[PDB]
Each structure stands twice: as C-alpha cells, then as structure tokens.
C-alpha cells in the first residue's frame, strides 16, 4: 500500500471501473489506486443472477455465454492491465492499481486520510467513495440464531455466485424470500436447474404477485405465470412471521397458518447504503432514502465525491434519490472520475434499469417506477425480435444499458405509462428493446398527453 495516491476510489466495483477508466482517458499519467475489500479484481454483477447459470468449468474462469452464445468475462478488464500498488507512485505513465482484500475503516476528510483495517495509512488528493451497499436480511432470520443464519444467502457477489450454485446441485429444496426483479430472475435459474436435477425451487413474498410494488397487478400476475411455467413454487401474499430449525430441516412458519419446510433459503429483499464512512468522516447521510448526500456535480466535500448504489443524488425530475442500476454506476462513475478532474458537469442523466428472466423475457425501466401511481398500459403481440436473446444477437451485448444507450431522443409485450396527472413521471417496458431514449425524452419533456395509445405507437 502506497502511503499517498493522487487519485483514490474507495470501493472496486462497477462505479470505481468507470472513473478509473475516465481519470484515466482525461489525464494520460494519471496515477489512480482502488481499495476493494472484497478478494476479487472489479467485475459486472448482472451476469450473477442470469446467463451464468445458463451454462462446469464456468464456475471457475466466470467467462460465461450471453444469449448469442459469445463469450464474455465478467471482469471489466484482464489481470493484466492493472499495475502493483507498490509501482503505482512512480511507474513510467501511471495507471490504476488493485488493493483487494483491504477495507477502508476510517476516513480524515480534514487531513485527506484514509486508514485500512490493517493498519495501513493513505493520503489523497481526490477521493471517490463508491462502496455500495449491503444486502438486507430479514428480521425473522436475525432474530433465529446462527443456524438459521448460516443457511441463509444475501445474493450479491460471486462468492454466492458459487456456494448457491454449489447447493443447487447438492440440496433437494431451496426457498427464495423476495418477489423483487433480483429474487425473480434467481427463481428463474434455479428452477431450470432444478428441471434437470428434478428438485424444488419456492420463491415467496408478501405482494400479490412478481414485483408487485412496481409492475402494475395485470403485468405482475402475467410475470408470476411465467415463473411458475418454470416449475417454481410460487407463494405470493406471504408474510413470514418466524423461521427456525426442525429435525435437521429449515422451517419457515407465515401468518396465514402456511408452513414451509426446505433445505436451504437466499433473500432477495433490497440493500442497506455502505455509510460506515460517515461516522469518521462527518458526512451527512440521508435518513428518508439511504446513502451519502451529494450536490448537483456528486461531492460530498470539496474533494469527496460518492457514485453508484452508494450515493443519494439529486435527480433533475424527482428530487432526493438513489437508485441500483448498472447504468447509474457506470454513468456517475464516468461524471465523478471526469469531475476529478476538472470537468465540473452536473449529473443531468436519467438512469435506467433493465431485467432479463432468461433470454425469452425482459423488461427495462425508467423513471419513477411505483405501482401505487395510477398507470396506463398498452399491450400487443410480440414479433419475433421482441426478446432478450434476438435484442443481443442484434445489438452483440448482454448489458442493456450499452445497447440501448445513455441518449435521449431528438399479448407478449407493451409499455406502462407512470402518471401524475397528465404528465408520465415513469416507464416500464415489457420486452420491448432500443426504444430507451424515446421513453427518456418523453419524461424529460414532460408535457401533458391527452391519449397515450397514441404515444404508445412511439414504442
Ligand atoms: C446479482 C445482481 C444482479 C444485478 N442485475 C442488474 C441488472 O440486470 N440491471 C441493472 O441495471 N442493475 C443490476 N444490478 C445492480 C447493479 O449491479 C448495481 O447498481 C451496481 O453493481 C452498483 O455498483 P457500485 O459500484 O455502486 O457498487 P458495488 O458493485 O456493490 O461495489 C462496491 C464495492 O466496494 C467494496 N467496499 C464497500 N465498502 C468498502 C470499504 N470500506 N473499503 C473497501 N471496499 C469497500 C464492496 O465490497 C464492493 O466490492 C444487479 C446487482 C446484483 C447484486
């Protein structure tokens, strides 16, 4: 660990990638050092929860298959191209480092250091706080002891990439706790592993159907179908009440009377803003919706800024927010690392979200996305392209937010229309690709619209 670095990203995730890779196109000899604590080099993390489970020597090398059967590594970039953190302060041009394995456990904003959990003591110039966040867990499984724990995954990172992999080929039943896109998408893969294993899968939550807090009740229900059509055990209107250890099996008690016995259960229920920075830090954190608060170019100080799932920005249309889009890390990641140096841009852009449960069904997102908001949804039947596998055969990527673009423009499938009053605050689009920059340019003008099944025509 070197003991000052003029560029440094707390964090080694996709937000710390992206301005990495800006510092770095701005400033040729930019000399830029990333601190992950987790033991692996910067990686994606959709691929997690959907083509790598479409595949055994995958689970090694993480070089999966999108849908169009090419090969793709689900780290940003080869081994190769980082420098040792120890020739970082002096190699010939510079580059960016990897100190993987190290935490960051408190921060002096006002001598600009940084000390990690070893010990070690770090000065900056520039800082980049793009730490993420932690997954949640329910209360039920805090309140069961160590056994139950044990036996419970927080899906985010490869690790539980591969220990649930692991025991989806060694266990008879598995229990999903979410009904959310991330706990969908899960239910889908391992119910086509479980096809071919003949063993269970269950996802349940306490909405009436598959993300029910967003998807309008007609899209919800139509979503749950498509799960069940995958051999999983839905259980929608599920409110876990207690879970705890029977005869060596996970025992799952809801309010309702239903008892759910399985042998292993991952939760898929949102995530806890990384904050622990602010204590020492003495930055202002939002109490309403989690993470650091930034101003309009993302600091947090004169030189701190936060990026990512981490940060709680202000959006140019709804006021205080954060979000967990890939779109969002890699976009704000570019603006902090370009605001790094000497950019001073405002964070103007509308973040999307996309989804794919298989390469037979997605959906994409934009905006204020609530399913309490009155809505307006018009269907039709899907052509043949209207799918995630044609729309990467077509495009060459699996990132939607690549192929659809961070641009603006100048029944099998629709779009769903969020309002307030007469004007559309927020999008949803079901199996419907490349038509992103229209659904921005029609909440960023936001005029009124008298119909709608005409502006639907746009899609
Ligand atoms: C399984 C899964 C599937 C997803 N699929 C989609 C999808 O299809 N579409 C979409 O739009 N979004 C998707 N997302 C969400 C998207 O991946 C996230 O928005 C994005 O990864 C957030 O990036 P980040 O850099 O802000 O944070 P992260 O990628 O979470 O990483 C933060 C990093 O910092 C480290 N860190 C934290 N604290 C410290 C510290 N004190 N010191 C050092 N390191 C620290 C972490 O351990 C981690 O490596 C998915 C997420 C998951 C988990």
Same mark, same amino acid.
């Given at each position: 660990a070197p003991s000052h670095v003029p560029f440094l990203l707390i964090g080694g995730g996709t937000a710390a990638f992206a301005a990495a890779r800006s510092i770095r196109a701005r400033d040729p000899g930019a000399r830029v050092l990333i601190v992950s604590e987790d033991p692996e080099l910067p990686y994606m993390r959709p691929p997690l929860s959907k083509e790598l489970w479409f595949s055994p020597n995958v689970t090694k090398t993480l070089r999966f298959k999108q849908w169009n059967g090419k090969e793709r590594s689900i780290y940003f970039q080869p081994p190769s191209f980082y420098v040792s953190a120890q020739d970082l302060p002096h190699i010939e041009n510079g580059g960016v480092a990897v100190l993987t394995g190290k935490k960051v456990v408190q921060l002096d904003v006002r001598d600009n250091m940084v000390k990690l959990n070893d010990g070690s003591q770090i000065t900056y110039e520039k800082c980049l706080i793009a730490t993420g966040g932690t997954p949640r867990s329910l209360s039920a499984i805090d309140r069961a002891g160590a056994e139950v724990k044990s036996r419970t995954t927080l899906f985010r990172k490869i690790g539980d990439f591969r220990s649930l992999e692991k025991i989806s080929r060694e266990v008879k039943s598995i229990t999903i706790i979410g009904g959310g896109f991330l706990g969908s998408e899960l239910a889908c893969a391992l119910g086509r592993k479980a096809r071919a294993?003949?063993?269970?899968?269950?996802? *349940?939550?306490?909405?009436?159907?598959?993300?029910?807090?967003?998807?309008?009740?007609?899209?919800?229900?139509?979503?749950?179908?498509?799960?069940?059509?995958?051999?999983?055990?839905?259980?929608?209107?599920?409110?876990?009440?207690?879970?705890?250890?029977?005869?060596?099996?996970?025992?799952?008690? *809801?309010?309702?009377?239903?008892?759910?016995?399985?042998?292993?259960?991952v939760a898929a229920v949102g995530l806890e803003p990384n904050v622990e920075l602010a204590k020492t830090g003495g930055l202002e954190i939002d109490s309403d919706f989690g993470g650091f608060r930034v101003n309009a170019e993302l600091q947090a100080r004169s030189n701190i800024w936060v990026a990512g799932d981490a940060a709680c920005f202000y959006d140019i249309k709804l006021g205080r927010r954060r979000v967990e889009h890939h779109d969002h890390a890699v976009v704000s990641g570019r603006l902090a690392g370009e605001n790094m140096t000497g950019a001073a841009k405002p964070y103007w852009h509308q973040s999307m979200f996309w989804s794919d449960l298989g390469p037979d069904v997605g959906y994409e997102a934009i905006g204020l996305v609530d399913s309490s908001l009155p809505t307006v949804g018009v269907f039709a039947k899907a052509t043949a392209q209207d799918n995630p596998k044609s729309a990467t055969e077509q495009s060459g990527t699996g990132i939607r937010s690549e192929s659809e673009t961070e641009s603006e423009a100048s029944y099998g499938k629709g779009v769903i229309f969020y309002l307030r009053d007469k004007v559309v605050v927020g999008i949803v689009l079901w199996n419907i690709f490349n038509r992103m920059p229209i659904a921005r340019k029609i909440i960023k003008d936001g005029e009124q619209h008298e119909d709608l099944n005409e502006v639907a025509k746009l899609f």
């Open positions: 294993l003949g063993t269970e899968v269950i996802q *349940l939550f306490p909405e009436k159907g598959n993300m029910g807090k967003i998807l309008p009740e007609y899209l919800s229900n139509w979503t749950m179908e498509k799960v069940r059509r995958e051999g999983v055990k839905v259980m929608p209107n599920a409110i876990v009440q207690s879970v705890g250890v029977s005869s060596g099996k996970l025992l799952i008690k *809801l309010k309702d009377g239903r008892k759910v016995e399985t042998d292993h259960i």
